[PDB]
Amino acid sequence: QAPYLSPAVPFSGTIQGGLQDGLQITVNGTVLSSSGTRFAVNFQTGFSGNDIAFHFNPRFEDGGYVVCNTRQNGSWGPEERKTHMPFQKGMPFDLCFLVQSSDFKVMVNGILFVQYFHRVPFHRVDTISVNGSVQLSYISFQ
Ligand SMILES: C[Se]C[C@H]1O[C@@H](OCC[Si](C)(C)C)[C@H](O)[C@@H](O)[C@@H]1O[C@@H]1O[C@H](CO)[C@H](O)[C@H](O)[C@H]1O
């Protein structure tokens, strides 16, 4: 699949073929400086946002932390939080998602940041969405 180039935020776009074991998704962009305190990347089914297999949500709040969760039919599950905040307001990032058989691995600027165990089948994910305090240069699939 060809990359999404300069997609406007909020963005949602199809992942051709769906998530597959071994697929790497790169999100390259820049956190905005003075335009809110959260952004999110969502791996989801369709365009509604009610079924999100993996919600990755950095929050520049309470010292900085990231939330990971899953939404099923509108309902959020148990939150996983890491206090490590590897993003900075105004700064560019390379955010890499790797789909593996039991989990996602998430790399930020070349360093493993978190994993997230699958709670729903990843093959049902056909769409990526990005929202909040970020601008995007590209989303690639490889
Ligand atoms: C308005 Se209810 C949802 C919020 O629940 C909050 O828990 C509230 C518990 Si009491 C009502 C006992 C004080 C969570 O801290 C918050 O992170 C959580 O926020 C959601 O978190 C979700 C992830 O779990 C999404 O990020 C969603 O966007 C965000 O609104």
From Swiss-Prot:
Peripheral blood leukocytes and lymphatic tissues. Expressed in lung, liver, breast and kidney with higher levels in tumor endothelial cells than normal endothelium (at protein level). Expressed in trophoblast cells in decidua and placenta in pregnancy (at protein level). Isoform 2 is the most abundant isoform expressed in endothelial cells. Upon endothelial cell activation isoform 2 expression decreases while expression of isoform 3 and isoform 5 increases. Isoform 4 decreases in pathological pregnancy. A beta-D-galactoside 1 binds at N42, H55, R59, N69, W76, G77, P78, E79, E80, R81, K82. Binds galactosides. Has high affinity for the Forssman pentasaccharide. Ligand for HAVCR2/TIM3. Binding to HAVCR2 induces T-helper type 1 lymphocyte (Th1) death. Also stimulates bactericidal activity in infected macrophages by causing macrophage activation and IL1B secretion which restricts intracellular bacterial growth. Ligand for P4HB; the interaction retains P4HB at the cell surface of Th2 T-helper cells, increasing disulfide reductase activity at the plasma membrane, altering the plasma membrane redox state and enhancing cell migration. Induction: By toll-like receptor ligands zymosan (TLR2 ligand), polyinosinic:polycytidylic acid (poly I:C) (TLR3 ligand) and lipopolysaccharides (LPS) (TLR4 ligand) and by pro-inflammatory cytokines IFNG, TNFA, IL1A and IL1B in mesenchymal stromal cells. By IFNG in macrophages. Up-regulated in dendritic cells following infection with dengue virus. Up-regulated in Kupffer cells following infection with hepatitis C virus. Up-regulated in plasma following infection with HIV-1. Monomer. This is Galectin-9. Residues 11-142 form the Galectin domain. It comes from the Eukaryota. Its main location: cytoplasm. One of its GO terms (cellular component) is nucleus. Contains two homologous but distinct carbohydrate-binding domains. GO terms for molecular function: carbohydrate binding; disaccharide binding; enzyme binding; galactose binding; galactoside binding; oligosaccharide binding; receptor ligand activity. It is found in: Cytoplasm; Nucleus; Secreted. One of its GO terms (biological process) is ERK1 and ERK2 cascade. Keywords: Chemotaxis, Cytoplasm, Immunity, Lectin, Nucleus, Repeat, Secreted. The chain holds residues 7 to 148 of 355 of the full protein.
